[PDB]
Design a protein around this ligand. Structure first.
Ligand SMILES: O=c1[nH]cnc2c1ncn2[C@@H]1O[C@H](CO)[C@@H](O)[C@H]1O
Ligand SMILES: O=c1[nH]cnc2c1ncn2[C@@H]1O[C@H](CO)[C@@H](O)[C@H]1O
Ligand SMILES: O=c1[nH]cnc2c1ncn2[C@@H]1O[C@H](CO)[C@@H](O)[C@H]1O
Ligand SMILES: O=c1[nH]cnc2c1ncn2[C@@H]1O[C@H](CO)[C@@H](O)[C@H]1O
Ligand SMILES: O=c1[nH]cnc2c1ncn2[C@@H]1O[C@H](CO)[C@@H](O)[C@H]1O
Ligand SMILES: O=c1[nH]cnc2c1ncn2[C@@H]1O[C@H](CO)[C@@H](O)[C@H]1O
Ligand SMILES: [Cl-]
Ligand SMILES: [Cl-]
Ligand SMILES: [Cl-]
Ligand SMILES: [Cl-]
Ligand SMILES: [Cl-]
Ligand SMILES: [Cl-]
Ligand SMILES: [Cl-]
Ligand SMILES: [Cl-]
Ligand SMILES: [Cl-]
Ligand SMILES: [Cl-]
Ligand SMILES: [Cl-]
Ligand SMILES: [Cl-]
Ligand SMILES: [Cl-]
Ligand SMILES: [Cl-]
Ligand SMILES: [Cl-]
Ligand SMILES: [Cl-]
Ligand SMILES: [Cl-]
Ligand SMILES: [Cl-]
Lengths: 241, 241, 241, 241, 241, 241
C-alpha cells in the first residue's frame, strides 16, 4: 500500500521497533552492512529518506543500527526521535574522522570523551555559554575496556564536530593540534547534549581515514579493516551497557 | 566490481555527469521520483551514502536532480562539490517547509528571496558580520514568472534555515512572524553563500507542509499535489536559466 | 511663530503630508534637488534638523522625497516614523556606494537584493541569529524593469551596510569581493527589517562613486550623470508600486 | 561657481578652518544657533549635506561648532575627519538625552564619564573584547569645574549610546537603571575611541529632555533654558582646554 | 633575608621543588591541612601571596599540594606555571561545589568528566568556537576506580565553572539541571585546556556543599567528612598516575 | 574554638567590622603590610582562605584594607560581599600593572578612569551589550588631587582587566597601545559594575611594574618605592571620600 504509519516525520518504525541500545553511523548503507554481518534476528525498521535502520540482536542482546546522515542538524533529528519517541537509552556513534594531531595516525581508533564544535546548537541550550558536548563515562569506559579485551590500541580524547567539511578557516588546524583534538568529524557535538536532555547515554568511536596535515590516507581495504576493528569494539561495548 | 572511481568523498559521478543546472531536494527518494517522472535521457549518476542523483533532460535541456540530506552541513558538502568539481552553474533547492506567518497557509508555494539562520557558517565567511544568504535574482524571477505562466499563486519572501528541527526556543516563532518570514526549513541559508563563492547561481522554492502556529497540516495527497505544482514551476524555471 | 506641531521628535510634517511612496537619500540637499527637478505639486513638509523632506507628484502619482542622514541609526529613526506615523507603504533608498567587486565599475547602477552589515540591529530583532536585510521582490523587480525600459544597464545583488565609513578592517574587502557584494554603503541593512516589521515594502538603488580596490573615482560630472540615470529608474519604478 | 574644494567627502572646510577645540551637537541648526549667539569672529566653514559648521572665538579663544547628525556612524565620520584631517585636539559633544535613572530628572545636566553601547564598533577595535568608550579626564574635570563656577548642579556618570532610538528591547531600561546609567543618547560611545586613536581628547555633556520611565518631558521653553545652561558650561570648559 | 629567588611572579619554588603530580584546592589553608595530615617527607615550597604549596610523598610516591585561589584567572596562573616552569605532568583539582541536579545531594562526591563555563578563555583558544574543557580519561578512571576500592559512591559527569559566584542569572539553574550538570564551581574549565596545551593531564573531584535548589547545606562536620572521603579518593588515584 | 561565625562563605568578619571605605589589593600579605604601617586602632577582621583583612583608622578616619586575590571572579566575590553584607560605600583598588603604552614607564602611577576586559561578566549585566566598567568620578578626582598635593606625577586613563595573565593573543598589545590603554591588570573591570549595582563608589590606582613591550622591569626596591607613593595617594584620597 502507498502509505504506512509514521511515528515521526523521518521514521516509519513503530515504538518498540528500536532496541534500547543503538549504533548510528552517517552512511545508511554502512548501517545495512553492519546489520547484515553482525546482527541476528534482524529486520529493517526504517527506510524513510533512505535512512536505513535495523533492529536485531548482537550475541543475543537487543541492538539497533541506523544511519544518521551528515552533520549536526541531521543527527539531531534522528537522535532526538530515538530518545524521545523510541525510548532508546544508549546511542554509540560509529564513524570515520580526520585528524590533525601529530601523534594520531591513519587507521587509529579514537574513543571520544567530548567534542568541540563551530555550531551554535549548544550555546542555544545553555544561555549562550559554553556547554561541553560530553560522552557518558560508562559508554567511554565500555569502549575502552572492549578494545583492551580485543587487543586493539585506541586513542582516547577530544573530537571536533564541524558544520563545514570543506574548511577555508586559517589557523583552525593549528589550534586543534595545539590542544590535542584527536578526531575531526561532524556529528558527536550534537548527539551528546540530546542524550543529556533525555537523561540518557551516548558516546562515539571513530577510525581515522585521513591525516589532514600529512595528507596520509587509508586505502579502501585499510578503511574496511579499520571499520571491522572499530565495529567489533562498539558491538562488544553494547554488551556492557 | 567492489570499487568505483570517486571524484569526491561523497559522489561517484565523473566530471561531466552533472548538467549545468541542478534541482536538489532533501530526500533522495524524492530525487528519484522527480527523475523517473519528469526527465528524459535519464541515468543515475550517484548512489554514495544513498544520496541518489540523476542526470537527463527536461524538455530537451540538460538537467540533474539529486538529494541533499537534511541540514546546512549536508547541503554544503553536496553543493560545494557540484559547483567546484562538477562545474554546475545553477542550483534550485526544491523542498518542503513549515510556516509561522499568519497569512501563509498549508499548500502554499514559497519562492525564497533570502534565508536567515541560526548557523554560524555565514558569520565565518564574513569576518563575524551579517552575511545575508541571498537568492540570485534571475533564479527568483524565473521561478516567479514560471508560476505566473502556470497560474499557480506564490508567496515570495524570506525563509529561515534552522539547525534544530525540534525547536525549544521561546520567542522564535513570534519574531519570525513579526518580520514576515514565510518559510521555515534547514538548508537554503547554507546554499546561497556557496553559490556566491563560485560566482554561480542558486535559489529555493518550497511548499508549506505544516503551519507551526495553527497546527494545520497537509495530508499526504495534498503534499503530493503541492509538490507537483512546485516541481513544475522549478522545471519550467530551468528553461530560463 | 517660534513653534510648530511635531508629529515626531524629528519631523514636523502632519500625518497625511507624506505620500504612500517615498524616495530617501542620505543628503537632504539632494532630496531638495530631486524635488525641485522631478516633482510637481511639490511642497516642503519637513526641515527639522535640516533633514529636508518634500511631497508632490511624479507623472501625477503622489511621491515624497526626504533625506535620511548617514548610517543605520539615522535611517532607522526616519524610516520607522514614515512607516508607523505617516503610514507610508513603500520606501526606495536612492544613494551612492563604493564597490570592491572586480567586475563592478564606477558609474554602475546597483539594484540591491539584500544587504549585509556589521551592525547589531538585526541580531537584536531575531534572538541573536542571522536576519537577512532583504529587499521586497516587487520593488526590486520594478527597479529592474524600469532600468530595462530606459536601456540603462544594472548590477543586481548584495550590498554591505557598514557602521564605519573609515574602515581599518583587514580582510574585509577581500571577503566582500570573494562573495560578490556589489555595493558598500551605510543604510540599507537598517531599512529593510523596519519595512518587514510594518508589513511594508522597501528597496535600494545606488550608483558606484568609487572603486575601493582600483581607486577609480567618478568625477563630479560623472556622479551627476550617474545620479540622473539612477533617479529616473527609481522614479519610473514608483509608478509600478 | 558650482564646485568647491573638498578636503573630505563630507566637509568643504580647508585644513586650518577648524579650531583645535570643537563643540559638536547632533542638530546642525543648533550648531548655527550656538555660533550666532556665543561666538565672535565667526564664519561658516562647512555646509556639505546641510551639516553646518562654524569657526570663531569664545571669549577670544578659537572655537568651532558643528553638527554631527544622529547615531554612531554619523558622528564617527565627522569626528574621524576633524581629528585626522583638521588636526583638532578636543571635541566636546553637547546634546540632549533621555534618562531611566530614578534620581535623574528632566532638565538635569549630565556630564558623561563613559558610555555603553549596543554598537559593534568598539568590539571591532579591540579584538572583540570590551573597550570602554571613556571620556578624557581633563575634559570631564573642566566641565565639572565650569558648572561649579556657574552654580549649575550636574549629574556625573555613565551614558548609553544606542543604535536604536525606537527601542523594543524588553529589560533594557531596567538594567540601565539598576547600574545607574544617567543618560541615553546615540553618539558618545562612538566619539571617545576615535579621540583615543588620535591621541586626542573628547567628552560629552547632555541635558535630560525626557524621563523614559516616568514619562516626564521638558517643554520647549524648558529645553531652551536647559540648553543655555549646558552650553555655557561647555563654552567655559573650552577655556580650560 | 628580605628577598628570595622567584621562578615565576607568583611562586618562589625552584624548578624541581614540585612533584610531577599535584593536587590543587582553592583554599591554601586547606592545602596546608592536606600536607600536614596526608604527606610524608613534606616541605613548604611556596608562600607568595599566601598561596601555600607543599611537596612530599603519599605512600612513598612524590606528590605536591597547593592552593589555586578562586576563579578561572587565578587557577590559570598557577596551573600554567606548574605545567610550564615546574614540569608537572598531572594536576587533580580537589574542591567543593554546589549542585542543581535533582538527583545529586549534599555530601555527594562528584568526579568531573568535562566542565562548561561562562568565561571566554576557551573561545579565545579555539578561534571563537566551542572548546570543551575535558578531563583526561586516565585521571577520571583513576578517581572512579579509587572510589570503588574505597566503597565510596560517586556521581560522574559535567561541572559548570562560573566567573560569578553571586549569580543573578534567570534560567541558568533550570538549564544546568535540564542537562544534568552535577557540580557548580569556578575553576575546572580553566584547568583542563591548559593541561591540553602542555600535553599533560588534569581532572577534578569535588564534594557537594550546598544544593542550590533545595537549599540543603552540609554542616561543618559533614563538610569535613566529605572532604576526608574525597581527599582519600584523590590521593589513592595519584598512585595510579 | 574550632568554629567561628561566618557572615559570608568567604569572610568571618561581623557586619560593622569593616569601615565604609576600603582599600583592596590582590596580595593579602600586602594588605597586612599596609595595615601594619599606615593604620592605627587596627585589628584583623578576616583570615578565611588566607585572605587577610584589617580595619583601623588612617589619620583618625575609619579605613579597612583587605586582599582580593587575582582575577575578576575573585574580586567579584569579595567586593559583592563588602558592598552588600558589610555596607561599604567606597572601595579603592590598589595594585600593580603592566603597560604597553609607549609613553608610560615602569614606576609610573596610573589612576584608572575605566577598564576594558576580555571577561563576559559585564555583557551578562547589560543584555549582552557593552557596559563600560567606569570608576566613580569623585574617587578619580580624590586620587588625582591627592597625588597633586603630594607632588607625585600620575597617568590618568583606561586600564584593561584580563582573565589571562599568560597571554598568547596576537595583536592584543598593538590594539591596547593604539588606543592608549595605560594599565594591564586583572580586576578593575569586575569591581566597578558591582559598585554601580549597589549605588556605591569604586576606583583604582596602580603602579607599573613591567613594560610589556620594552621589557623594562622595576627592581624589588623600585616596586617598594612605587607602592609607597601609590599607597600614600590612596590613603590621602580616602580622607576626601
Ligand atoms: O576530515 C573530516 N572532516 C569532517 N568530517 C569527516 C572527516 N573525515 C570523516 N568525516 C566524517 O565523514 C563525513 C564527511 O565525509 C561526516 O559525516 C563525518 O562524520
Ligand atoms: O517546520 C520545519 N522545520 C524545519 N525544516 C522543515 C520544516 N518543514 C519542513 N522542513 C524540511 O524538511 C526537513 C525536515 O523534516 C528539512 O530538510 C527541511 O528542508
Ligand atoms: O565606500 C563607501 N562606504 C560607505 N558608505 C558609502 C561609500 N560610498 C558611498 N557611501 C554612501 O555615502 C555616505 C558616506 O559618504 C553613506 O551615507 C553611504 O550611503
Ligand atoms: O531617549 C533618547 N534616546 C536616544 N537618543 C536620544 C534620546 N533623547 C535624546 N537623544 C538624542 O537626540 C537624538 C534623538 O532624538 C540623538 O542624536 C541623541 O543624541
Ligand atoms: O555554588 C557554588 N558556586 C561556585 N563556586 C562554588 C560553589 N560551591 C563551592 N564553590 C567553590 O568554592 C569557591 C566559592 O566559594 C570556588 O572556588 C569554587 O571552587
Ligand atoms: O602585566 C600584567 N598583567 C596582568 N595582571 C598584572 C600585570 N602586572 C600586574 N598585574 C597584577 O598582578 C597580578 C598578576 O601578577 C594581577 O592580580 C594584577 O592585578
Ligand atoms: Cl558511516
Ligand atoms: Cl521499512
Ligand atoms: Cl577539511
Ligand atoms: Cl524532499
Ligand atoms: Cl551509480
Ligand atoms: Cl518546529
Ligand atoms: Cl545622497
Ligand atoms: Cl517645513
Ligand atoms: Cl572605506
Ligand atoms: Cl542638538
Ligand atoms: Cl560653506
Ligand atoms: Cl526609547
Ligand atoms: Cl578548598
Ligand atoms: Cl616558602
Ligand atoms: Cl549561586
Ligand atoms: Cl597587591
Ligand atoms: Cl580573624
Ligand atoms: Cl602578559
Amino acid at each position: 500500500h502507498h502509505h504506512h504509519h509514521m511515528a515521526t516525520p523521518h521514521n516509519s518504525a513503530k515504538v518498540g521497533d528500536f532496541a534500547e541500545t543503538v549504533l548510528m553511523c552517517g552512511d545508511p548503507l554502512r548501517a545495512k552492512l553492519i546489520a547484515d554481518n553482525y546482527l541476528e534476528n534482524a529486520k529493517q525498521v526504517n527506510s524513510v529518506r533512505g535512512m536505513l535502520g535495523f533492529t536485531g540482536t548482537y550475541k543475543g542482546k537487543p541492538l539497533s543500527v541506523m544511519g544518521h546522515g551528515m552533520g549536526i542538524p541531521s543527527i539531531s533529528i534522528y537522535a532526538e526521535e530515538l530518545y524521545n519517541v523510541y525510548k532508546v537509552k544508549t546511542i554509540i556513534r560509529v564513524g570515520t574522522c580526520g585528524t590533525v594531531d601529530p601523534n594520531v595516525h591513519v587507521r587509529d581508533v579514537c574513543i571520544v570523551t567530548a567534542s568541540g564544535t563551530d555550531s551554535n546548537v549548544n550555546r542555544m541550550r545553555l544561555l549562550g555559554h559554553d556547554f561541553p558536548a560530553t560522552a557518558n563515562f560508562e559508554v567511554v569506559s565500555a569502549l575502552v575496556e572492549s578494545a583492551k579485551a580485543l587487543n586493539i590500541p585506541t586513542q582516547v580524547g577530544k573530537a571536533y564536530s564541524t558544520d563545514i567539511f570543506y574548511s577555508k578557516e586559517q589557523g583552525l588546524n593549528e589550534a586543534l593540534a595545539q590542544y590535542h583534538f584527536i578526531a575531526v568529524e561532524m556529528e558527536s557535538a550534537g548527539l551528546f547534549p540530546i542524550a543529556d536532555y533525555y537523561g540518557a547515554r551516548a558516546g562515539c568511536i571513530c577510525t581515522v581515514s585521513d591525516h589532514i596535515i600529512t595528507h596520509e590516507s587509508a586505502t579502501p581495504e585499510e578503511r574496511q579493516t579499520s571499520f571491522q576493528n572499530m565495529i567489533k569494539i562498539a558491538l562488544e561495548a553494547t554488551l556492557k551497557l
